[PDB]
Design a protein around this ligand. Structure first.
Ligand code: TON
Ligand code: TON
Ligand code: NAG
Ligand code: NAG
Ligand code: CL
Ligand code: CL
Ligand code: CL
Ligand code: CL
Ligand code: CL
Ligand code: CL
Ligand code: CL
Ligand code: CL
Ligand code: CL
Ligand code: CL
Ligand code: CL
Ligand code: CL
Lengths: 231, 95
């Protein structure tokens, strides 16, 4: 999977993501966008598969946008002890709980970072104001690292696949470089939802296992766009 | 166009809120689909261990997490163990 939060020259923040997973021929037919209503009014939007109640891609309108990528660390028995004996939270559920109860980008980044989990994950959050963008590397008991946007220092985009950003992506699976490569060339002046979609449409960022691509901006909720990918 | 768009009112009890969506889906496609994600990656005794202890396991998970799954599995006629196995699929193999 590949999550990208980036800022453009005019101060806007965009969030896009890819979701790769086997059994694609099935999940593509079951993929749906869902609008969760409170009192008849939309409270947040998400992309999920029929039968899955958690969210791996969501948007709280005019507050923030969050997505999740897999982080495989620890031992198999950690997830067991954490889930049953310690009663930690599932990843996809916390992501959904936050989209519904967090009152601000700051509040969401707090919940997604400090709430205990059953297993590790990468949480990517975007905001409605400039420089609001982070990549929360999660340990089970807390945050292992927070990676903030810094446009004035030249970092106007964060690219997260499934590996810690302070280390190089493995040779076997290095979808970070072609994603950075396409962003380095797109330019902070040309960045938009249309362009950010074409970034994620690059190979091998867009590979055989990609199921859907979502591009979203918390301050432009009506532009929430998901597209099923048939490679 | 993109994928279908549905509404899920959180003002409806957890077990009922997902059901208006399932009307649009073949109860067989969903159920048969699960067996392919399940049968090929988990032995039965695990599934039996879960099934036997599934009703005590769901006591631990968040109430609204399981309640929504329970309602879908009754409507679709799925085993609750199969339900909890796909929703905790990430947590089952992420280490
Ligand atoms: C009809 C089913 C089989 C689909 C679902 C089941 C039995 C689990 C069900 C059936 C009814 C039910 O009541 C919810 C209404 O409560 C409003 C305030 O609490 C909750 C669950
Ligand atoms: C009950 C589950 C499996 C649905 C979820 C939890 C999180 C508790 C879980 C998740 C993972 C898990 O790992 C067991 C691997 O077995 C290897 C055998 O040598 C054990 C339990
Ligand atoms: C979801 O709810 C809104 C609330 O006004 C409604 O307008 C819309 O039609 C609903 N979505 C669908 C697909 O019916
Ligand atoms: C529904 O589930 C019950 C209990 O497992 C079973 O006896 C029945 O044949 C099932 N019906 C369908 C249509 O799946
Ligand atoms: Cl909720
Ligand atoms: Cl809050
Ligand atoms: Cl700025
Ligand atoms: Cl830990
Ligand atoms: Cl731990
Ligand atoms: Cl990475
Ligand atoms: Cl398009
Ligand atoms: Cl395509
Ligand atoms: Cl309807
Ligand atoms: Cl459909
Ligand atoms: Cl209809
Ligand atoms: Cl047994």
């Amino acid at each position: 999977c590949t999550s990208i939060v980036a800022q453009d020259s005019r101060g806007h923040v965009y969030h896009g993501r890819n979701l790769d997973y086997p059994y694609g021929s099935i999940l593509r037919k079951l993929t749906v966008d869902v609008q969760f209503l409170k009192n008849g009014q939309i409270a947040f939007t998400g992309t999920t598969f029929i039968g899955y109640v958690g969210l791996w891609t969501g948007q709280s309108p005019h507050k923030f946008t969050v997505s999740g990528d897999e982080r495989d660390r620890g031992w198999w028995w950690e997830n067991l002890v954490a889930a049953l004996f310690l009663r930690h939270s599932p990843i996809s559920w916390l992501l959904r709980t936050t989209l519904s109860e967090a009152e601000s980008f700051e509040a969401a980044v707090y919940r997604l970072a400090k709430t205990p989990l059953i297993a590790d994950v990468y949480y990517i959050v975007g905001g409605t104001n400039p420089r609001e963008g982070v990549v929360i590397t999660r340990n089970r008991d807390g945050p292992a690292d927070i990676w903030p946007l810094d446009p004035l220092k030249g970092v106007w985009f964060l690219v997260e696949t499934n590996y810690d950003h302070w280390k190089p992506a493995p040779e076997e699976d290095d979808r970070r470089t072609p994603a950075i490569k396409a962003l380095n060339a797109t330019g902070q002046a040309k960045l938009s939802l249309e362009t950010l979609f074409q970034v994620l449409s690059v190979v091998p960022v867009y590979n055989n296992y990609t199921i859907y691509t979502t591009v979203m901006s918390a301050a432009s909720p009506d532009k929430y766009m998901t597209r099923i990918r048939n490679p | 166009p993109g994928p279908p768009l549905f509404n899920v009112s959180l003002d409806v009890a957890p077990e009922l809120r997902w059901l208006p969506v399932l009307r649009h889906y073949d109860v067989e496609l969903v159920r048969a689909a699960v067996a392919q994600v399940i049968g090929d990656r988990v032995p039965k005794w695990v599934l039996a261990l879960i099934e036997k202890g599934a009703l005590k396991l769901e006591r631990l998970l968040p109430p609204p997490f399981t309640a929504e799954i329970r309602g879908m599995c009754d409507f679709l006629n799925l085993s609750l163990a199969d339900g909890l196995l796909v929703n905790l699929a990430y947590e089952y193999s992420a280490f």
